[PDB]
Symmetry: D2
Subunit: 333 residues, 4 copies
């Protein structure tokens, strides 16, 4: 049997093509998913662009997705055909020091390898993943597909920031896929949350309904300093502001380098202020369960921008640069 898929044999958004692919088949411990929705993320854009190398080639991208189990492989229990699932996107062995402490995204054995990057992903009608990565959910699958990358990454960032109730928390890029959940989880944890945006005027009512106590331009951020925590995955163009608005014991937490990876760090201010500069990536397997349950209970919300058919995958990827996008862009195969 065969399937529709978006694939590229050489990198470049222009080489991403609708094709007819061989439908994959789950082996032991694997399930085959009929994909209902896949998110559109910087990660996916960058796999397509070649900035992140992929296997196998030619490659089907798509690391954030949800759908219905079509077939359980040999020996799979716990998930069965017809189950609506959402996929944890990190391959983990379950037996290394990192997996056994809960840090399955840091797996020493798989190298943190990511579904849709070191496997064929979900911009496709079907995808195979390990059964243990498929989390059964009763949530609307559009909303679920915003969880594996956006919500979970934001969760892990907020968890590693050690937010105490009443602490002031700035979220940089609060309008983005990660940010908009970063606002929510910082509020969940008791923070007073200041959402930072270069388009405050358009976005203020949205970010407040995400739970922001205040929306600030970058300039307003400077005056409102100091903050106890800055959650900022946007990279080096934000560094002078985000590093400079921290107070004593302030924690800068990043999981991305959107505008560049290299920053000039003043160790004298790092130690003079007792600041912590903290890396976060992906999220823990147990935390992904929590984030799913919280969506299902309505304690967090999914902000959707637009759903594209699989054939418009290119237009969908471009919509990531749209100055009007607030919310998640989805592909529906």
């Amino acid at each position: 049997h065969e399937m529709r898929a978006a694939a590229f044999s050489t990198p470049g958004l222009e080489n991403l093509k609708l094709v007819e692919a061989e439908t994959p088949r789950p082996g032991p411990g694997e399930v085959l998913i009929r994909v209902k929705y896949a998110g559109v993320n910087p990660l996916d854009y960058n796999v397509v662009a070649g900035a992140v190398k992929a296997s196998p080639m030619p490659h089907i991208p798509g690391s954030e997705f949800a759908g219905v189990v079509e077939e359980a492989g040999p020996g799979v229990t716990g998930v069965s055909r017809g189950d609506p699932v959402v996929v944890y996107n990190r391959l983990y062995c379950g037996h290394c020091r990192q997996c056994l402490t809960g840090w399955t995204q840091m797996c020493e054995v798989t190298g943190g390898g990511i579904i849709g990057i070191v496997t064929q992903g979900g911009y496709a009608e079907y995808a195979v993943v390990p059964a243990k990565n498929a989390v059964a959910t009763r949530a609307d699958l559009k909303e679920a597909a915003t969880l594996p990358i956006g919500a979970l990454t934001a969760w892990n960032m907020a968890y590693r920031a050690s937010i105490s109730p009443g602490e002031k928390v700035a979220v940089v890029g609060a309008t983005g896929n990660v940010g908009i959940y970063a606002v929510q989880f910082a509020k969940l944890l008791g923070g007073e949350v200041y959402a930072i945006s270069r388009r405050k005027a358009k976005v203020e009512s949205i970010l407040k309904s995400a739970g922001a106590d205040a929306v600030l331009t970058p300039d307003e951020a400077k005056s409102a300093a100091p903050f106890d925590v800055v959650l900022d995955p946007t990279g080096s163009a934000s560094w002078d502001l985000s590093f400079g608005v921290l107070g004593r014991g302030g924690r800068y937490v990043t999981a991305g380098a959107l505008t560049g990876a290299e920053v000039r760090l003043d160790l004298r201010r790092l130690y003079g202020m007792q600041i912590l500069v903290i890396g976060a990536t992906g999220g823990r397997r147990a935390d992904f369960n929590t984030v799913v349950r919280l969506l299902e209970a309505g304690r967090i919300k999914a902000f959707l921008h637009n759903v594209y058919p699989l054939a418009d995958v290119r237009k969908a990827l471009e919509e990531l640069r749209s100055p009007e996008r607030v919310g998640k862009v989805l592909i529906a195969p």
Copy 2:
């Protein structure tokens, strides 16, 4: 009454001269100390050289000292005449947010101010300090005089590194005033400790006497990676090595910038490895008590190099640079 003291009316090492000075008198809340031993540290050299503004001017430096109480001031209790004491050198208000959570070195009211920098210090026969800053001790005052700067700062770096039993801990600059205690505290917390030094041949048996499991040159440290924790206050010249040997979840802890303050921090590696880059300064007032108790009970050892009389203070501060020094330079007024 007059006393001998090393003072400088204008910054610079050649401008540090022995003089006859007005003997200070303790106000309410203060104690007058007959200084027995003062430590010689980079902080003291930088005060005398002018990299740190000091007051009053002319200025008696000396931020790390121990001695005997000569007189208690109005309303002081708990500290009678002749009590041997060692002096916690941060001025703190005891009422601000930071003081009230225990981060007394971060006090918002005193500007973190340091005895012997914003007050006249211990390179003199007598000095005055707040009574709350004077810790009674039964320890040999030569050894007590290594605790306010070297031991306490190393204590506070180790504490903020979250050392678990069995984690691999590298100490860069391990031969120095801070590193020699950092080796000890890392072992005390149950780490497996790798002291790093450019003088391995000369210093190996001393760093083992301090509790190091292994003693490595910089190159050898690259081969022993990964490390869970790198205690390293040496600044930018060690950054590539120190940051490059960290494993997943690794903590870099710095309290200094000896060789340079600016480093190029790569956010991609920080988030991809979930590393934390952590600043540490001084130590908490309660932890200084603990450090003093640990010396009195023999759980940590002072490593001494030379004692100089107060007349030789120029020679004492130049010994900081000597490639034969391993251990603490003391001044005895």
Copy 3:
């Protein structure tokens, strides 16, 4: 001046008499407050009844009050005449192990001595408290006066329960002075909050306005088990229920012994479930500032029942046992 005051020269509520007393005067480090509101709590009742020895005799009770500074003592700066304040009620030295690590209610030197118990309290027009115990606030002093005992004790219980977002939290005695804030703080930390009441039908709409996700009868609590955290200051009559509904790694936190002090603890279920049974009392000096600012911000809400004048003080204390009460009972001198 003379002032009015409730007072008892010998224990017993009938022997509590409105009198005219020597208006007290503030020494160094003290302030004299003009009490506007004072809360009524089991602690005030039990002090009046002789259960808790009081000093000095005859004694003015009243351990939770807010008002306006009448007169700064000598050397007191950082507060003015006419500044509205609310009183942190534990006396603390600021120099012991406990004070320096932030646990000022555990002070080794005052023994945790309480204002209105070891000093003349705020069931009176004026009272003298240490200046450092007096917190400036811009909130309604009626609501402020619910914080020194009710909110702060609840905060410290929730803080010591280690609530993660999504954990299930039961609050026994949610209708009371402590419970009504424990519901709120548990929600602030991201818990799913189940308030348990013996009078669900009457109080349910109130406890939901305090933030409870559900209100439960004791039988319904049994059916909703397991719970991650149980905040329960009610003592032994609630023990079998609260301890029995805990799940794996569950935490029982109490600050009270309302219905009895002794419980039969099954060590085999404690270890087999890895449960923690945790004590909590009072609150930290720094957290009191956080509770004040959270009231000022609107993030917590005070629930008031009735305000009595100093004349009807015995009726106000008798209102504690009133089975219709939900909220705080204030005395207004």
Copy 4:
């Protein structure tokens, strides 16, 4: 193929017989182990006696053992024939909240089921265990065989006591299988360790070689209060001592109910002192790896007492009560 085995078809020491039994064969995910040494614990005693129910019946006991992989079932990687292994004794699914957060001994799926209790155990020439439970080690298997019950359980008690360097930690029953390692771990975390024994004269030197700073009689212990931590798996006969010697913020941690499960708990002292009473059982799978490495590194030591052959399994079990015993009793099949 047949093997030798100690087995009982009805509970009671007298019913434990040496038998010839069918040699077990490993299925998928399992390894067969030629047992070289197995520990003798109260747990194995109570299984043979009937206080702990077991399956299957008739039953081979033995929950703490090490040996050599003889065969691997289908699809087993990471463990091979010839590997010298020590067996983590909790069965764990690896997919539930407890497992994915690292608390494998609390698995919701297996109930925390223990090898040799719900499976055939190690009092035999061969046993089958899950491959993921077999930890290859370079230690002497005689010493490894003291880790699965004695060492790991102590580790997990110490872990859950949150021992700060310098804190006073009491170990009740320090002479026992668990206590002899608890002493060690408390010292490695930086505690000042007071070992408690009813036979101090007889055992003082041994406990001091395990790392105890002082050895105390029960009466000496009351006089040496307060302690910050009491590690005590001995149950109710020690409760008044252990609970009563705690200071402010003290932690009582238990993993056992040796002398009785029921204790009368004064909630009012619990909260007035902010004590935590903490259950601990087994240990985490990740910590078990940490414990084996510490043994391989000499940072902890095995205190052996006697090694019996399989046929003497009765006298080895009876050897648990020998008032001379200090050390592990072992069986060697």
